[PDB]
Design a protein around this ligand. Structure first.
Ligand code: FES
Ligand SMILES: [K+]
Ligand SMILES: [Mg+2]
Ligand SMILES: [Mg+2]
Ligand SMILES: [Mg+2]
Ligand SMILES: [Mg+2]
Lengths: 97, 122, 111, 137, 32, 86, 78, 100, 97, 50
RNA sequence: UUGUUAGGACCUAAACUCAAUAACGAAAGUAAUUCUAGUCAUUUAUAAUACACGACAGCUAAGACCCAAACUGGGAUUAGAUACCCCACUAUGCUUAGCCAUAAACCUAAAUAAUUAAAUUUAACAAAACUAUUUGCCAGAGAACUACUAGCCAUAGCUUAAAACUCAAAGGAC
């Protein structure tokens, strides 16, 4: 499902068309701004441990939330049990990985 | 066709060996052959003890005779040479030069996936 | 038997038309390239070529039904000679009966 | 300038001599190690019998006749008869793959004979005689 | 496929198994 | 029987180390497969069983070699944790 | 997926086969880095613009031009 | 504004061609004991061992020389529909780069 | 459209396939010196293609030449002739530890 | 052209074929000069004639 | 009798390594070497009441006989084994002429030309799925690889193959 976005194969290494990235990134950044404008909750999520501290530092700088640790089963589908009766779930989840 | 004879002869002195190679090559001609070349490979020790005509042999003279003959003559030639008392072991084969070394690009990798499906499925 | 059997002095099909052009060739060289110093397969390529000329209007074409039928008559007569010596060869006995059946099928389409 | 595992080549000249004897002359110790009995015979290089022994001749019987210690005793016994006859160096041709294959060679060493080489002549047919049927147990 | 694929009588079996395993361990057949 | 005696399957004893010579001769006769041949040739193995075994041995080797390859492909990644604490 | 092969690659392949990689080390952090091979391909192109049609002529002439520049090209068959 | 196609054609990584047995300059960014994580400008970093000679010289930020082998270590194993990647590159550390 | 777009072509940097030691070399039953390089010094047994390193074609060529030589009184069967023990080592086999 | 050359080569080669007239003389030349078909290859695939 | 024999005879039977190979043949089947003969073009699928073949085992006649070996005999075993184990030996495995036509003869996959998308595990396990074409075959289970009929160097056989009867299951994968 990624072959649409691949510019080609440079000697075994797939290259990503940066023109499709620019269009898609424009849409994603615009969407992320309107959600933040409306005071929605944004949660950054990644399991890459090299960038765990960077992503937690980014979320703190933005004013948003980060979950870079082991993700518990039911965190979103069973939030009321895990967090409390009136827990407000995120309005947007950004998957850096 | 073109046949390569491999004639192991009894270890003898040159006078008698030359007589053995004249009698042999004459037989090829008597069977309708056209002898092309005669080569010697030297006297040496046999790889094992060959027993011919009620005598055990440990040393023999190796010779090659390149020749042409009809396909029907190959059988008669070997039959006649087997009755000669100075012939340890005659073997006629098709001449190697008539067969030409094939051309190869290299070793093409065969995948392991296609080696286990063969071994199991059949 | 058949009316025509290639002579032993005939050249093989590769050099059949080349040796005549050469001005002078030795008797030995002619004997090496004759049908005497060739396999039975070579003698059959000469039998087939003779039949194609004597029957087919265009002997250059070998894909016509008449040419394919001629190719199978040479094989059939070859297998019959084989089976006269190898009386218990069951693989070639199958080859003989399958060529006969193939010829009959082609003769039907030709008709 | 190194030792060669490969034996000397018969019909050539070599610098290896044992007790003023060439390789072709050193007597031969024929060990037939079967799964029941281990026999031993020592012969001169002209094929003349000098010593003979086996687990049976030592006095072992039935199952004990086919152990490691039984062949060791047979080797020591073969050495003693050979040592009396005038043998110091032996070429060990060990046929068979039984329990006393090695022990018979160890007994010969303990008995005062010096092994210079170890050959193997276990029969291996190249296609031969149909072996007996597998035992159902 | 491959990944999925991968009294008197006891006296006779006890003695013979011993008689055979001793031979397997007297050579490198199992391992060096 | 017709060949020359003492050339085939013959090792030479170095400095009276008669055990070392024997232990090398066994490694030779085993690497060449004579040991397995002599063992199996004691009783008749029927052609149908011979093919089933040789097929199983081939497939077993291929599986072990690939599993060994994977264990060695990740041999380098087994190192101290660079991102300890995160 | 299209294999990405530019026309310079024909020249670059010959350069690596004849001289290997330039003894100077590639610096992939400099966005405008010019390697020994990239200068070879720039000169090879310049000569080809003049109209030389023989590949052998363009390959040996480019080596001479770089030699004048002072670049150390070793024709390492090993 | 230059197009992406132009950027790729003239990119240093495109000029390198095949990365086997090539020479590149890397930078140490992370050190764990005697293991050096070196960025050579590619997608994945490599991990080398601190050489016995001049070990103290290999500190963070130190530019070094490398001989690339693979840009990514990946291999397909029996019963796998995709390649297994360790998210790492292969290179041989040759030594420090002379500042000059 | 774009001059910088990639051009279809066969891989310039393609690496030549790996040949065997006997690739494009005649294998004759009378060249017992070459034949002896693929048998065992002690038993004389033919080595497999995982030891000789030959391809399928040349492995069969050597096999047919050894058997013909052994059957025609040129080569021994139960060992390697001592006169070829000095020749180079081509087979990946170490009897000594 | 190829077949004409092959015929001409064979005719040139046929000059040196053995016959009843030169049999004894050719036998002695062969005996005087032994031939060797032996040669060996290295791990690099290089012939090593001795 | 045994061991050894770089002693003689014999040429019975079977073909180590190669073979970690996957070739050939319609299937059965086929791998010691050499030589001879030899596989090949029908567009393709589709055939019996015809023709030709058909592992192993078995019969007929004359040979062969190294070894193996139903069976038979002797020795052990056990509360007793016609068993499993040991020894001896036979039909037989081999050859040359005739017959027998049977295997889980199964890759348990009919033979062909497609496609890899139909937002298709379309039960589950096997071997990803599916379409088109032609023939053969199947229609709950036992009765039944049976009875009878017919064909056949077969004569307890082989192929073809029911009914009464009795039940509400039989059967498959997990
Ligand atoms: S790789 Fe070419 S013949 Fe072996
Ligand atoms: K009994
Ligand atoms: Mg026989
Ligand atoms: Mg032929
Ligand atoms: Mg009998
Ligand atoms: Mg009826």
């Amino acid at each position: 499902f990624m072959e649409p976005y691949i510019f080609g194969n440079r000697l075994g290494q797939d290259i990503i068309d940066l023109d499709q990235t620019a269009l898609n990134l424009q849409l994603a950044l615009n969407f992320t701004a309107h959600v933040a404008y409306r005071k929605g909750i944004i949660l950054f999520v990644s399991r890459n441990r090299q960038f765990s501290h960077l992503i937690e530092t980014t979320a703190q700088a933005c004013g948003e939330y980060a979950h870079t640790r082991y993700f518990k089963g039911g965190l979103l589908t069973n939030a009321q049990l895990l967090f409390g009766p009136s827990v407000r779930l995120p309005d947007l989840i950004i998957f850096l990985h | 066709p073109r046949y390569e004879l491999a004639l192991i002869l009894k270890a003898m002195r040159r006078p008698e060996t030359a007589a053995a190679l004249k009698r042999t090559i004459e037989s090829l001609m008597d069977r309708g052959a056209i002898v092309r070349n005669l080569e010697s490979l030297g006297e040496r020790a046999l790889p094992y003890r060959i027993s011919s005509h009620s005598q055990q042999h440990s040393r023999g003279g190796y010779f090659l005779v390149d020749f042409y003959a009809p396909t029907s003559a190959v059988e008669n030639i070997l039959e006649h040479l087997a009755r000669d008392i100075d012939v340890v072991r005659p073997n006629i084969v098709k001449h190697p030069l008539t067969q030409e070394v094939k051309e190869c690009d290299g070793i093409v990798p065969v995948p392991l996936e296609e080696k286990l499906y063969s071994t199991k499925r059949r | 038997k058949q009316d025509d059997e290639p002579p032993s002095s005939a050249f093989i099909k590769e050099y059949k038309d080349i040796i005549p052009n050469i001005e002078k060739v030795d008797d030995v060289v002619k004997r090496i390239l004759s049908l005497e110093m060739a396999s039975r397969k070579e003698k059959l390529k000469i039998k087939q070529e003779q039949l194609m000329n004597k029957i087919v209007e265009n002997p250059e074409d070998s894909r016509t039904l008449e040419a394919q039928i001629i190719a199978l008559t040479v094989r059939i007569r070859n297998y019959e000679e084989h089976m006269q010596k190898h009386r218990k060869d069951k693989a070639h006995k199958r080859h003989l009966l399958m060529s006969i059946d193939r010829r009959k099928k082609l003769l039907k389409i030709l008709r | 300038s190194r030792f060669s595992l490969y034996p000397p080549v018969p019909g050539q000249e070599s610098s290896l001599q044992w007790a003023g004897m060439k390789f072709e002359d050193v007597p031969i110790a024929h060990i037939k190690a079967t799964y029941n009995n281990t026999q031993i015979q020592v012969v001169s290089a002209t094929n003349a019998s000098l010593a003979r022994a086996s687990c049976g001749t030592e006095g072992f019987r039935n199952a004990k006749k086919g152990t490691g210690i039984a062949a060791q005793t047979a080797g020591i016994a073969a050495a003693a008869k050979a040592t009396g006859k005038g043998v110091t160096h032996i070429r060990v041709v060990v046929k068979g793959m039984g329990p006393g294959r090695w022990s018979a060679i160890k007994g010969l060493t303990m008995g005062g004979l010096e092994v210079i080489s170890i050959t193997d002549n276990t029969p291996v047919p190249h296609x031969g005689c149909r072996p007996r049927k597998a035992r159902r147990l | 496929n491959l990944l999925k694929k991968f009294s008197i009588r006891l006296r006779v079996l006890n003695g013979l198994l011993y008689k055979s395993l001793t031979e397997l361990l007297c050579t490198p057949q199992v391992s060096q | 029987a017709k060949h020359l005696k003492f050339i085939a399957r013959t090792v030479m004893v170095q400095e009276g180390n008669v055990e070392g010579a024997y232990r090398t001769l066994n490694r030779i006769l085993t690497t060449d497969g004579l040991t397995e041949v002599i063992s199996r040739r004691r009783y008749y193995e029927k052609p149908c069983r011979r093919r089933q075994r040789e097929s199983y041995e081939t497939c077993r080797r291929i599986y072990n070699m690939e599993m060994a390859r994977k264990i060695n492909f990740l041999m380098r990644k087994n190192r101290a944790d660079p991102w300890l604490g995160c | 997926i299209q294999d990405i092969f530019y026309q310079e690659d024909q020249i670059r392949a010959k350069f690596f086969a004849t001289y290997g990689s330039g003894q100077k080390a590639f610096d992939l952090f400099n966005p405008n880095f010019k390697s020994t091979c990239q200068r070879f391909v720039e000169k090879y192109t310049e000569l080809q613009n003049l109209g030389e049609t023989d590949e052998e002529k363009l390959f040996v002439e480019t080596g001479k031009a770089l030699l004048a520049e002072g670049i150390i090209l070793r024709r390492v068959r090993e | 504004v230059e197009s992406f196609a132009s950027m790729l054609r003239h990119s240093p990584l495109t000029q390198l061609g095949p990365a086997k047995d090539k020479l590149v300059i890397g930078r140490i960014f992370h050190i764990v004991e005697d293991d050096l994580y070196i960025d050579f400008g590619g997608k994945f970093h490599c991990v080398c061992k601190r050489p016995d000679v001049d070990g103290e010289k290999y500190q963070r930020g130190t530019r070094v020389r490398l001989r690339l082998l693979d840009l990514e270590l990946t291999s397909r194993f029996l019963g796998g529909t995709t390649d297994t990647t360790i998210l790492e590159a292969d290179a041989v550390l040759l030594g420090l780069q002379e500042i000059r | 459209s774009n001059e910088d777009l990639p051009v279809p072509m066969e891989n310039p940097y393609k690496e030549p396939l790996k040949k065997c030691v006997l690739c494009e070399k005649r294998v004759d039953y009378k060249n017992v010196q070459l034949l002896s390089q693929f048998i065992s010094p002690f038993t004389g047994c033919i080595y497999g293609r995982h030891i000789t390193g030959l391809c399928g074609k040349k492995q069969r060529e050597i096999t047919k030449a050894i058997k013909r030589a052994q059957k025609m009184g040129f080569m021994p069967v139960t060992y390697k002739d001592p006169a070829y023990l000095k020749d180079p080592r081509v087979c990946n086999i170490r009897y000594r530890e | 052209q190829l077949k004409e050359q092959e015929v001409l080569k064979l005719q040139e080669e046929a000059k040196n074929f053995i016959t009843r007239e030169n049999l004894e003389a050719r036998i002695e030349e062969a005996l005087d000069s032994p031939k060797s078909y032996n040669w060996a290859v290295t791990k690099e695939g290089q012939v090593v004639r001795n």
